[PDB]
Amino acid sequence: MEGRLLLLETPGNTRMSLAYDEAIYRSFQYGDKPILRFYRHDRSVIIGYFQVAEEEVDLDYMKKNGIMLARRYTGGGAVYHDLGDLNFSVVRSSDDMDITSMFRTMNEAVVNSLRILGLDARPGELNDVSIPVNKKTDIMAGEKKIMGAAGAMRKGAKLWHAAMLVHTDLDMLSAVLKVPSTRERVANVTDFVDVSIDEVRNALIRGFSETLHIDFREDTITEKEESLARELFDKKYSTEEWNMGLL
Ligand SMILES: Nc1ncnc2c1ncn2[C@@H]1O[C@H](COP(=O)(O)OP(=O)(O)OP(=O)(O)O)[C@@H](O)[C@H]1O
Numbered sequence: 001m002e003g004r005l006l007l008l009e010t011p012g013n014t015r016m017s018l019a020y021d022e023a024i025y026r027s028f029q030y031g032d033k034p035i036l037r038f039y040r041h042d043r044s045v046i047i048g049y050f051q052v053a054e055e056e057v058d059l060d061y062m063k064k065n066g067i068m069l070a071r072r073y074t075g076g077g078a079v080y081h082d083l084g085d086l087n088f089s090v091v092r093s094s095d096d097m098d099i100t101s102m103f104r105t106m107n108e109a110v111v112n113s114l115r116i117l118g119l120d121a122r123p124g125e126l127n128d129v130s131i132p133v134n135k136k137t138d139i140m141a142g143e144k145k146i147m148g149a150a151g152a153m154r155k156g157a158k159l160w161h162a163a164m165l166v167h168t169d170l171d172m173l174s175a176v177l178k179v180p181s182t183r184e185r186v187a188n189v190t191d192f193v194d195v196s197i198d199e200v201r202n203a204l205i206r207g208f209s210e211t212l213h214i215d216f217r218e219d220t221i222t223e224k225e226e227s228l229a230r231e232l233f234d235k236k237y238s239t240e241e242w243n244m245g246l247l
């Protein structure tokens with residue numbers, strides 16, 4: 001019932017940030033304390049594990065506006081992040097491989113969280129990874145998408161991470177990601193309520209704590225975890241074969 005709240009970031013370096021995630025996920029052993037990580041990324045585009053960089057983004061537009069190109073451990077679509085986006089991930093013990101339940105429980109915690117801020121949201125309905133919005137892995141505010149999520153599961157452990165749009169540049173996001181309006185399909189938490197990043201963070205902290213019945217206490221990353229992260233970074237996340245999609 002005791003948990004770890006990690007306010008671990010790496011702005012300026014999206015690739016190292018993703019490395020931390022896989023690091024806390026891979027070092028984790030069945031029975032450890034649940035982990036809740038909050039973090040942000042500066043202007044960058046993150047694609048899923050099975051994606052092909054040159055199939056969702058124009059490497060040129062990103063070379064022009066200084067958008068970092070990073071690829072994550074989990075599948076799913078391509079997203080645009082900037083400091084207006086509040087990313088967070090949960091790592092806990094797992095006794096099965098049921099993906100549907102993880103997303104259902106996590107989305108439940110997020111809904112309870114935004115309620116606290118007076119924002120009534122709901123999870124998407126469709127079971128289609130290809131469609132941009134209204135997926136069961138998304139959280140909707142009315143008809144607009146405000147949060148996207150992906151995850152992975154292995155024997156004894158599961159990972160779930162999300163990206164919520166608090167005050168992100170919805171135009172820019174639309175411009176960088178190819179789909180085929182999108183702009184008209186997403187929205188920021190602040191379109192509904194005037195709240196800061198921390199307020200949304202503190203809201204989610206209570207939400208996940210109350211929903212999951214886990215007392216998350218601010219903690220720091222461990223040497224073991226930090227080492228593995230540097231490891232994952234140096235040998236994968238900081239390489240082109242991985243970020244392009246060849247590794
Ligand atoms: N920072 C963001 N947070 C939430 N949704 C976003 C963000 N940036 C863009 N989007 C919208 O969310 C979509 C994310 O891709 P997709 O719908 O395939 O799954 P996802 O699970 O939300 O991806 P993530 O898990 O967001 O990489 C984009 O195509 C876009 O329409």
Ligand SMILES: [Mg+2]
Nearest residue numbers: 137138148149
């Ligand atoms: Mg999603």
